[PDB]
Every structure is written in C-alpha cells, then in structure tokens.
Amino acid sequence: YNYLYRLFRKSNLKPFERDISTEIYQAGNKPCNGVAGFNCYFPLRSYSFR
C-alpha cells in the first residue's frame, strides 16, 4: 500500500498534468462539506498488490 490511485473525479485530466489535490468527492446532488459519508469519497483508494 505504498501505491494508491484515483477513480472518481469531476472532470478528466489534461496531458502531462498530475492532479494531486486531496479534495473530497461529491458524487450526488448534495454536497459533502469535507466530511465522509454518502456521495463522500476520498479521491484516492489503495491497490491490494498481492
């Protein structure tokens, strides 16, 4: 788990652009206000490289 990845983002990336910000993700019509919950996904998840 030294390596992680992103799968949800509001908009796709740009060539040679490294998106790095740790901003909570809102997948629903309602906001998240910086608190985990429904439609509240941390932008990064970790791979289980076994």
Binding site: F16, E17, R18
Partner: protein
C-alpha cells in the same frame, strides 16, 4: 518583481512562485502559503510540497522608462515564458512594432486560472 499563477491561489492546490531578485530569478511550484499582502523585503511562508524549481540569471536588466514585455502561456504542462526589454522615452503603450524572443519553458504541470502580480511597496 514576479507573479503568482494558480486556479485557487489558496495553498489548497498547486500555485507557482516567481521573483526577479537583483541576483537571479527563482521559480518554485510548491504548496506555498503567502500572506495577505506578500512583497519581498518573506513573501511566502511554510513552503510545502516543493516539486519543481529553477534559478538562472535574473530577468530584468537596465530618463527613458524601461519597458518589459512578457507573454505568459501554458500548454500541456509546459509553461512558456517570453522575455522582452525595451527603453521607452517617458502614460501610453508605445504605438510601434517589435517581436519577443522566447526565453524558457518549464514543465510545471499545474492548473492555472487566475494570476496576481507580486509588487513592492516602494
């Protein structure tokens, strides 16, 4: 002496930093934390996530007010900066004609939407 470029300019996301020190120029893309009125003597504070830097000969050399033209433009991470210096006799942009040599391109790779100039008090 320089500029601050960024889509947030709030240390939440990346924001480049540029300065024309009388000794050199220094451009560093870190998660810089500034103050309300940042000017050099200290402009920033708590340099975090320093990922890219560049220092070389400074930008601006020397009755006639000196004119310094620059075209700041960014493509696919490659931020392009053009340099130009021209003496102007004593306002109004001088109706005339000239070109701009390119100066340097750096692979900062950040999102930029707003930019604010770094100015000295006097």
């Amino acid at each position: 002496r320089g500029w601050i470029f960024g889509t947030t300019l709030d240390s939440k996301t990346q924001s480049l930093l540029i300065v024309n020190n009388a000794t050199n120029v220094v451009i560093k893309v870190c998660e810089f934390q500034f103050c309300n009125d940042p000017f050099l003597d200290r402009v920033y504070s708590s340099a975090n996530n320093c990922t890219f830097e560049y220092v070389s000969q400074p930008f601006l050399m020397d009755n006639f007010k000196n004119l310094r033209e620059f075209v700041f433009k960014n493509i696919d991470g490659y931020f392009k900066i053009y340099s130009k210096h021209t003496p102007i006799i004593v306002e109004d942009l001088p109706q005339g004609f000239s070109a701009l040599e390119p100066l340097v391109d750096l692979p900062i790779g950040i999102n930029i939407t707003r930019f604010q100039t770094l100015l000295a008090l006097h």
